[PDB]
């Protein structure tokens, strides 16, 4: 008997189903580590990460909400992206779009 | 991508189909629905979702909520669902999916610069409780009650004076005025009751005109047919409630006479079982009527091994009875009946008793209304199994029936359900956050009108708020003007019209009561049964449709020795 | 811990009893507040232990005697009442004429 | 029918001819009169008298009292009688027979729907005490004092600052204004004193115009003939009181010079014995004058075995004296005289000293003014027997003489006797309820302006209000606006006229002082003696009419180790 | 006549050339000047100087001070001198020679009937501290801080909600309004910060218009170049300060990018070392810029033996990080660097870091800002000896440099230096009195706006205020209306113009902020260094001009186990 | 003494621990609040003694075992945190899964 215990039925949960995704190889050319969040507009990440920014426009990481992907200096790794929804309007980050797209 | 359900529950709390044990009881709830969009849940922290341009938008204050409770598991009379809760202007704005419409789908609760967040993932959220049987013997009762999860307190008194020790009456315009003024200092919603024991109507009308939202008829003040009738008449005119504690001595008549005086008009019966008061020994037969809104006080909930021994002296002290005086003790004794005390628990489970309350420091415990309600639910699941209404392998319906008892039902019965009583849009943000391991025992957060009023708080000088010693301390919601703005003083329509708030210079928000005469047994959420109940004049056996109603005394209960230091 | 006001209040009863406990141990005749605190704390530990209300209503009359307290004290205490969490929730214990 | 006196006293409290021991002292009081009509006493509870149509009437609020204290044994300067007390509008309405004129005889205090009740049968009821020697060193003093039964506190200060540590002065308009504002937060009646040590009158007039009800002349500020004279002159103009603590050093002259400065004008002398201050060693000779209203501070009341040892260091710390500095210690020592300390107790018994006060945290104990007054009464009964005024086998007159010392006399001396000071109709309802076993030690109820302000309260979560731990907790009378309405801030006539209350936005009720210049020794109730007293310049022997006045030091006192935990 | 210096120091405190040890540290201060006239010092007590016609004059209130602090040893950024302090109207009137011009020479601070006195001889007097990094997690923080000597608290929050647990933001107009109202109940000066993490300017402008004096940019809300830029733009328009906690993840860029966003505009950087937050691992390089006003939080001051072990979990709880989640812990770990933690202490000693603050209950201790500042000063004297600026055999300059860190510098940085921040004429009388043996640990008196607000107080019922138990208790300065009059609520110029105080009905005195955009590193009193500092990307070594900056961890510190019960 | 609020607050922790200490001595299985108070007070005395944070983070897991507490208690306490004055100022001690 455990006070307030959960009884979670086994199985998996499919995240961000139905949306466009795309893979991209990212390489950290910086000398310090960089860590990206699940909803950050990827195309505007730290300029030290080298990748095809054009393909990642309007995309974010296809990872469970709240989690993150880390890149140590010099690291190269392929990540999966998923397209932004709602109004698909981007405001903030590095201030590159600041409107729809 | 894909995530296993277990790790999912660890981050965002349980989802549809997952079950959670309520504290250390045998009651289990099952998530019936989740209003989220998997992968788009909002979460706060470094690198998380709620950040400028991401989970947070660019909207002005007027277009976003002030506070958002992320990933909460709501437990209310209407459902047990997982969702985000949005609060705006001290009131519940919406129950759904929070986030940024700019980049997220199905956002109904917008988050912006003006949005504060309370992380409720892994927590059960409920409306604040409502106790309609308070004796204002001391101001200290409000904190005790608030700490346990009760956000509204209705009752009466002037302090530690004989009258109040025994009855919930705030005698006269002067005392009423005084208590309305003192109420601004309390961190809970308040509404007073006047002394309704009088045969001249104008003496009651002044009290209602002075501020009370109801009239208490107590046998200690003389619960006679004439008095009862007078109060109900004024009640019908002014749209206020009448709470009754009938004639135990059978001095002016029996239960059927009191019932005849009542004349089929709406009335709220206190401790309908009778150990706390009422015609001996069958005042419990009242719950079979359509105009009766029956409630129980808490010392008898649930039937345990020490209940009877403890009751005799408790009774003597409260009503100012002399143990040496024979008739004072014969009376005291005729009130305590193992038979009715046992039947009461079942009647609650069947939905024949619609309310639970304390009867603070007068045969009741102010910080145990919620705790005891669940102890009865547990004991009934253990003794009788699932209810006829249940579906699936959970106790969801039993929980909805029991939660309604100290939330929505007390609110409908006293005509304040339009302001409080449950988690529905437009209602005041009186919410309670609980860790599942402490459900109904000790709360994580108590929110009054959109502001945290009291919460567990560790070392004030520590580097984080979690180091010991952790104990409940008042928060900003309970400070000066912030409190006034976050609490309600319930007035009668006559008083609100007369400018009582202006004359007394009351500072808190004002609410008015209405719909006290129209409520009936049928309106009590999940607790609207009217059984053909009988009580034997000598054996005191309670019978419904002939079948015997009874239960066995518990020797050990959950939500007890595992949580309290004393 | 999440101590509620009622738990913190009882901490005062407990501490007061520690005071009386030592003095009694020195062989002093206890006064009014010491006597009440001492008998009271005893009952609370009785509940923690799981003893019944009926049992404590009896045991509570054998904590102190007329010979261990100050003159007039026994008559200043017609009864003692305390509440504690028993295995089956909170219960009120009333000890009549605890000192004889 | 017929009832034996013993069972009668058990239900309704003692009646005429019955005696009651005050706490654990040797003082006995005897009921001199009972204003009831045997068989028609009002009592509250289930089945009792106070019930609709019976002991309670059908009258509107305007025609009945708000609160009634049933079957009380009143102890005041005018009598020791059994009666019902009626309170209306925060003031004493009547002292007589409560009930329902409809069915009861001789009802003078009508009870109705608007009537709250406090059961005082078996209890002694007194007016709230008045301490005129407070040092506002900390706000915490008000609670300590209120808990002991003192409802009015007069004195001065700004907090824990040197000036206030030694003197009862609230320096200047700014500080005065500030303290008047802070006073609204205290649950006691308050009146401030300004620093009266100045030779320029306009500097005093501003202080009186700013709000003070009196001027304190303290040697630490320079108690010179010129200063004394200036203050008394302003006093005579503005109708305020002057409290003096004379020149112990004999620096500007001797007692006869200070007395010459006083010029026969009305003045209240602090610690007239002198251990607390005043011309060394015969400032006590002052009590022989008609314009002198003499009071004592409490550390010296009564003369016990540890009194002298304890005094030296107490003196050093209060007045900021340096123990290394010779003259600072010679001074300190000339102030403590066993001879005068012994004479003082007798002088109180003879009625030569009319007041008792604390001198809070400055050679006085704020929660012991009442307690020590009775300890002297007991010690004097034990040493000298009955007074010449006594009649019957009781100590009634000695009690009336001693009670007057911290109630009516302090009230007349400071010109507030029209509002408080005793249990008489029209006065503010500042009352204290006591169980006879704890008389003068720990109160059952402390009522401020008709509302219970502080009382002993047990477990807040218990089923009754009696379970342990029971300790004093604030009540509604002490909460926010209810407090403002139940307390008085005494102003000077100039200040009340100038609109000081409006400008400072003070919220509490306002009273004005008057009749400070007209009082004389002859006006001190039961304490108006003017003896031909002398003090020997070297032996310090006090003599009245030649006979030696002295008493022996007590080794054990009542109202001590039997009641306190520490 | 003539008096030896030793006996002189015993009566009037030390004079020119005398040295005093600060608490139990190795720091020594030397009196640089004495503004008295030997033989004419004012002293209070029986027979002393401050008496009518002597040390006290005949002047009206308007021509004398309200309170005088006699013989104080002032320790401030401008000097360490002995003098009398005069206070009038809640503000510092003068710093010089008090007395009576009638009979004394060079009196600049006149004493009269309206003058109250605080004897400060033998005491060190300082201005009240200012903490600009408060998280309003609980109202209890104000007392803790006030007790330690901090009289002004700037920061933000709504209570124990996730947002506030991690960030110092008071989200939106509603919460801002609510906190401004609740602030009147606190006995300290307060100014709020809004959530500045937004890319749309109007969302920030409302917050400033609603009442905040600054905007906090926190990475948990998204510290992106776009957000940073937006906030600074609004800041420049409205004359408010921006406090930053940068992007530790390097998610949107590195320190040089954040610095580029800042664009050379004025900004206050929080925990510039980085253990508390900021670009990993060289956010410390910021202190080399002219527009950067760098401060440290307190858990890392000074570098001791347990610092590192204690940090990991402290970090996890504050920012809501999941220890199971790898990236949440890698992050948590990259933040804690022994190298930067060591360099920080030196940088403070060199004057490269200008401020010290708490970061209350979010990786900071509210009652230890002052205490830890001196512990660093001590550890640096011990490790590095005298500063290049020192003169004579004392640590006077090091003390002036360190005191400025929690007094004047925090005040200039937030645009409130015109009201508080130091002991200069015209400023609010927020002063702290200390016995030299407890300097920086436990204060003798804490004065708010000319009224003692909190102080150590012994037995309330004792004959003097010194008997045990002695612990800090609230004074009159902290009561109701006296508090409102003695505290300030800092508003933004927009809010003060919009009538926010009138609309919210705030009762306390109001101050407005200004000069937040004009301050630069050069303006930080005694802490204006801009060093060519570098940090190694892997070794994390901090270097200034190439030379290595580092220090050794202390195993035992003063102002610790000798003063605290726990 | 000049006790600050934080010192007086810890007095509550200490007193609560005295309560748990006696019950454990009677042989009772401690509950949630007793367990937290007991392990917590231990750590505070550890600092007074001068032991290091690292040491206490380890010693704190050996105060009580799964067999001395009530069922469900160990899982109701994932960690315990207390702050005390060490020879080198105040420090936070965090004991993870103290009961096993």
Swiss-Prot record, chain A:
Gene Ontology CC terms, in alphabetical order: urease complex
InterPro entries reported in the protein's UniProt record: Urease_beta-like, Urease_betasu_sf, Urease_subunit
Source organism per UniProt: Klebsiella aerogenes (Enterobacter aerogenes)
Name of the protein in question: Urease subunit beta
Cellular localization per UniProt: Cytoplasm
Record-stated family: Belongs to the urease beta subunit family.
The entry's keywords: Cytoplasm, Hydrolase
PANTHER family hit by this protein: UREASE (PTHR33569:SF1)
EC number: 3.5.1.5
Keyword Membrane: no
Molecular function per GO: urease activity
Catalytic activity: urea + 2 H2O + H(+) = hydrogencarbonate + 2 NH4(+)
Name of the gene: ureB
GO biological process, any: urea catabolic process
From Swiss-Prot, chains B, D, E:
Cofactor descriptive note: Binds 2 nickel ions per subunit.
Positions that bind substrate: 218
Catalytic residues, chain numbering: 319
Record carries keyword Cytoplasm: yes
Every Urease domain range: 128-566
Phenotype when changing residue 220 to N: Reduces activity 50-fold
Outcome when changing residue 220 to A: Reduces activity 1000-fold and increases KM 10-fold
Subcellular locations according to the entry: Cytoplasm
EC identifiers of the protein: 3.5.1.5
Consequence the record notes for mutating residue 318 to Y: Abrogates activity
Sorted UniProt keywords: Cytoplasm, Hydrolase, Metal-binding, Nickel
Biological-process GO terms, alphabetical: urea catabolic process
Effect of residue 135 to A: Abrogates activity and reduces binding to nickel ions
Origin: domain of life: Bacteria
Effect of residue 319 to N/Q: Reduces activity 100000-fold, but increases KM only 3-fold
Subunit structure: Heterotrimer of UreA (gamma), UreB (beta) and UreC (alpha) subunits. Three heterotrimers associate to form the active enzyme. The apoenzyme interacts with an accessory complex composed of UreD, UreF and UreG, which is required for the assembly of the nickel containing metallocenter of UreC. The UreE protein may also play a direct role as a metallochaperone in nickel transfer to the urease apoprotein.
HAMAP family xref list: Urease_alpha (MF_01953)
Protein name: Urease subunit alpha
From Swiss-Prot, chains C, F:
Superkingdom of origin organism: Bacteria
Name of this chain's protein: Urease subunit gamma
Pathway assignment: Nitrogen metabolism; urea degradation; CO(2) and NH(3) from urea (urease route): step 1/1
EC top class named in words: hydrolase
Subunit structure: Heterotrimer of UreA (gamma), UreB (beta) and UreC (alpha) subunits. Three heterotrimers associate to form the active enzyme. The apoenzyme interacts with an accessory complex composed of UreD, UreF and UreG, which is required for the assembly of the nickel containing metallocenter of UreC. The UreE protein may also play a direct role as a metallochaperone in nickel transfer to the urease apoprotein.
Localization of this protein: Cytoplasm
pH dependence: Optimum pH is 7.75.
Organism (species): Klebsiella aerogenes (Enterobacter aerogenes)
Primary localization class, coarse: cytoplasm
Assigned protein family: Belongs to the urease gamma subunit family.
Annotated catalysed reactions: urea + 2 H2O + H(+) = hydrogencarbonate + 2 NH4(+)
Gene Ontology cellular component annotations, sorted alphabetically: cytoplasm
Keywords: Cytoplasm, Hydrolase
GO biological process terms held by the UniProt record: urea catabolic process
Pfam families given in the database record: Urease_gamma
Taxon lineage: Bacteria, Pseudomonadati, Pseudomonadota, Gammaproteobacteria, Enterobacterales
GO molecular function: nickel cation binding; urease activity
Enzyme Commission number(s) of this protein: 3.5.1.5
Activity regulation comment: The apoenzyme can be activated in vitro in the presence of nickel ions and carbon dioxide, which promotes carbamylation of 'Lys-217' of the UreC (alpha) subunit.
